[model samples]
Target: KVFGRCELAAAMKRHGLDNYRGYSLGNWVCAAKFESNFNTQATNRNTDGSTDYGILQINSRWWCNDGRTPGSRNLCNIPCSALLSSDITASVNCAKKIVSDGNGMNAWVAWRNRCKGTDVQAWIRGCRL
Candidate 1:
């Protein structure tokens, strides 16, 4: 199970997720909610056989590898299992690197579709950040 929204926000804040790598906390929270319901162990098999990893639902085809995809790009250089952790530090670091360039959060289809242009205030509301 994952932390509650408030708890997750607090945790992410402690981990320096607020304004991390030029992205808003709301973006992280909103994406986490829709992607994995805040569960670190969440994994979904894509129709193309690639799997999504962790809270951000990063794909193995590009970000990390699960040994199933031997030819994956593995930009993160970490195993996909690294993301399925309650600590979330590995996932956060990987995400930071993922967005380090000018790509922004465009890698996530859900972010482009749902989080973009949406009022994300509720994602951090009452979090006392």
Candidate 2:
């Protein structure tokens, strides 16, 4: 499912993403925007044969168990399919694990390239939480 910016922001906040892992609420929303454009079904198959899944694009190699990535660790311990849903609970929970594991927002290259070290307030402006 696809979400409007504000809608996704509110959802993220409700999911307990506000300022998670030393990042701002807007940063979380911006990462999601850049990673998946608020599209829950988003997926990107990498050349490494590891696919990025769902809104935050969690990878199969180290995070989710897609059963395709060679040497897959399945650190998130959930099927990659869980990330594909619109609920955002599993995705948010996985992301919480990711960023807390010393990677922080750096877990996402999209966040580094697009939302890191910037005022991501634009992502949540005018959105009521």
| Candidate lDDT (C-alpha), each | 0.84, 0.88
Which residues of candidate 2, in runs, are more than 4 Å off?
none
Question: Model 2, 98: alpha-carbon shift in Å?
Answer: 0.3
Task: Give a tens-digit lDDT track for model 2, residues 14-78.
Answer: 88888776688899888888899889999998999999999999989899987788877987789
Model 1: how far residue 81 lies from native, Å: 0.9
Residue 109 shift from truth in candidate 1, angstroms: 1.4
Best by lDDT: 2
Which regions of candidate 1 deviate over 4 angstroms?
none
User: What range of 10 consecutive residues in model 2 has the weakest lDDT sum?
Assistant: 15-24
Q: Write the per-residue lDDT of candidate 1 for residues 81-127, one digit (tens) a residue.
A: 98998888998888888878678888777888889788987889987
Deviation of model 1 at 79, angstroms: 1.1
